[PDB]
Each structure stands twice: as structure tokens, then as C-alpha cells.
């Protein structure tokens, strides 16, 4: 997976910021942000979500259907937010906008 090819619209500094946020909230360091790590992230960001809200956020970008976010899926959140592709009620929008990222 090349995030430089896949997401050229992202500066290389923005990309390492995103890697940093990703590594922060992947507590277990398995390379994924799972449902509980996402829940904690939305709380620590100040935009807590319902349990089923968190599952629907993951499903929006869970391209391999395993219920957890790999780093390429986590990048896709900000790609979709940046391109205006998120539904207006999506928790991913709140993740992006509460995140300290633009
Ligand atoms: Ca994890
Ligand atoms: Ca996944
Ligand atoms: Zn996977
Ligand atoms: Zn897109």
C-alpha cells in the first residue's frame, strides 16, 4: 500500500500527522483501531458516539469487512471528509472536524 500514490492530495507532513494520530489510538499496537479504541478516541476528542454509531463509522470505510480500521482505511476517513463525500450526519465528519486536522 502506497499512501503517496493512493492519497496524493495529502501533504507528506499531513500524512505523518495522520500516522501519529493512528499510532496514538492503536493502544494494543496491533496495527488496527478496533471498536473500543475508536470509542475511546471519540471520547478523548470530545465527540463521543453511540455503540451502533461507532460501528456505522467503521463500516463506512471498512473495505475488508472485518470491523476494525487498518491505517489505509483510517486515511480514507480524511480523504472522504476532505472530498466532501461523508454524509452530513456521519460520526466520521465529527472525527475529522474534532481531530486537530484539516
Ligand atoms: Ca488496535
Ligand atoms: Ca477493516
Ligand atoms: Zn482488515
Ligand atoms: Zn473519494
Numbering used by the authors: 79 to 180
Excerpt from the paper describing this PDB structure:
The EF-hand domain-containing protein 1 (EFhd1), a homologous protein of EFhd2, is localized in the mitochondria. Unlike EFhd2 and AIF-1, EFhd1 is localized in the mitochondria and may regulate mitochondrial energy metabolism. Here, we report the crystal structure of the core domain of mouse EFhd1 (CDEFhd1, residues 79–180) in a Ca2+-bound state, comprising a proline-rich (PR) region, two EF-hand motifs, a ligand mimic helix (LM-helix), and a C-terminal linker. In addition, we identified Ca2+-independent α- and β-actin-binding and Ca2+-dependent β-actin-bundling activities of EFhd1, indicating that EFhd1 might be involved in the Ca2+-dependent regulation of mitochondrial morphology via interactions with β-actin.
We determined the crystal structure of the core domain of mouse EFhd1 (CDEFhd1, residues 79–180) at a resolution of 2.07 Å and refined to Rwork = 20.9 (%) and Rfree = 22.9 (%). We initially attempted to crystallize the EFhd1 ΔNTD (residues 69–240) construct, but only the core domain was crystallized due to proteolytic degradation. The CDEFhd1 structure comprised two EF-hand motifs (residues 91–162), an LM-helix (residues 169–176), a C-terminus of the PR region (residues 79–89) at the N-terminus, and a C-terminal linker (residues 177–180). Within the structure, Ca2+ ions were coordinated in each of the two EF-hand motifs of CDEFhd1. Collectively, EF-hand 1 and EF-hand 2 of CDEFhd1 had a distorted or general geometry for Ca2+ coordination, respectively. Collectively, CDEFhd1 formed a compact and rigid domain structure through these intramolecular interactions. Although the sequence conservation was limited to the EF-hand motifs in AIF-1, the overall structures of these proteins for Ca2+-bound states were relatively well-superimposed (RMSD of CDEFhd1 and CDEFhd2 = 0.403 Å for 85 Cα atoms, RMSD of CDEFhd1 and AIF-1 = 2.089 Å for 63 Cα atoms). Collectively, the overall structure of CDEFhd1 was similar to that of CDEFhd2 and AIF-1, but the hydrophobic interaction network between the LM-helix and hydrophobic groove of EF-hands in CDEFhd1 was similar to that of CDEFhd2, but not AIF-1. We identified two Zn2+-mediated interactions between one CDEFhd1 (MolA) and other symmetry-mate molecules (MolB and MolC). Zn1 was coordinated by H129 (MolB), K133 (MolB), H157 (MolA), and E163 (MolA), and Zn2 was coordinated by D142 (MolA), D144 (MolA), a water molecule, and E166 (MolC).
